């Protein structure tokens, strides 16, 4: 949105880059930050931890009613059955979309997000536009931003992550997928479907 007071993106990037490099140099001299530490954190969240993990959990719940029960009872413990868990997912609570209820998750106070199953959040999730509006006009937001029309008679539950509890949406299994393999089902599961801003992929 236009702000006549704001510097160019290039100038902003130039200034941030110098400030970060300066701070980095100081933390390096303190002995608390190293290049290998930086590279390891980046590697994990670029290549190891991402929404494909959440997708594995969803399709197991879709194809295993007992596991689904355990998942909804204690998300952290159920996900550990698949070797999934850890930082910013220490306390996970999964919530089930149905014909009667639709769930969507937000962190209005910051950016909180279940890293072990979704990886790091996309920037829009962390930004003020989504955060401000989804608790106030979720039906209109889903329609206008995501092309997702939730009928007015259907309840929308918005989960604001004000604590270390991390809410994750278990999307409804799309019609026309009877007997599909877990691998085939996983192709329908998106990051967005586990935030609640889109359903799982149709067809």
């Amino acid at each position: 949105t236009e702000n006549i007071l704001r510097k160019s993106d290039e100038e902003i990037q130039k200034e941030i880059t110098a400030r970060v490099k300066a701070l980095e140099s100081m933390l390096i001299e303190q002995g608390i930050l190293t290049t290998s530490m930086i590279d390891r954190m980046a590697e994990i969240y670029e290549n190891e931890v991402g929404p494909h993990l959440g997708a594995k959990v969803v399709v197991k719940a879709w194809t295993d009613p007992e596991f689904k029960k355990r998942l909804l009872a204690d998300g952290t413990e159920a996900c550990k059955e698949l070797g999934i868990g850890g930082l910013q997912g220490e306390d996970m609570m999964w919530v089930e979309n149905t014909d009667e209820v639709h769930h969507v998750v937000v962190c209005t106070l910051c950016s909180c997000y279940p890293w072990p199953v979704l990886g790091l959040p996309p920037n829009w999730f962390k930004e003020p536009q989504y955060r401000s509006r989804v608790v106030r006009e979720p039906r209109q937001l889903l329609k206008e931003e995501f092309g997702f029309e939730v009928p007015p008679s259907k309840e929308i539950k918005v989960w604001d992550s004000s604590s270390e509890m991390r809410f994750v949406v278990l999307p409804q299994r799309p019609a026309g997928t009877d007997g599909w393999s877990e691998e085939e089902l996983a192709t329908l599961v998106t990051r967005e479907s586990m935030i609640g801003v889109e359903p799982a992929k149709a067809v």
Binding site: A22, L27, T34, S36, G86, N123, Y130, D160, S163, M165
Partner: protein, 228 residues
Amino acid sequence: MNGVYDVGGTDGLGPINRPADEPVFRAEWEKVAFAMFPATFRAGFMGLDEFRFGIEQMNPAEYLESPYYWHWIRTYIHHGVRTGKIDLEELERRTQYYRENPDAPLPEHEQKPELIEFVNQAVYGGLPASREVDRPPKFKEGDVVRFSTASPKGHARRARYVRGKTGTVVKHHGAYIYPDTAGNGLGECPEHLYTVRFTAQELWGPEGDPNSSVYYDCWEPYIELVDT
């Protein structure tokens, strides 16, 4: 505090910017900012609640429009100064140096296996905030409660849009680190934690979506009984 970061319910912030796709890290400085989190945590700059409070104290205009990981940089510097671990004058001098010499090297340093071990343990083991306390939970599922109208200047998880509002306890989660102490350097002082359901009409008035509710987590001191 009643900072602008507390954006739930604010109108006029604009349309969502959502590119069709995006990388996890948009620039190398973002990788550095991200990795500084376990680094400064291990070094005792701050815990998680304090980390959040540093961001909450940003210049509001800067907060609203800066790249996300710039928020993290601000809170590192904030706590570095608070703890005396970062000299601001030296940081400013080094900033100017790297402005003028962007490709100048970083300081020579040794790699440390213990920092990789720390990263791996934190990532895959987590940093659980759950705690055992001696007191039983005061509230239970189905209790009708009212959220506090307190307005502390220090850190808390008291979004303005739920203050003074009436809701129903949905779940008791056990006890957890309490932000109102931890974020202000006053320690964990754990409290029982509850998810509470607020209707959209309760939050936004008679106009509200009659078929929507917001679920919001409340530490025990945040809420008091209306009806059991």
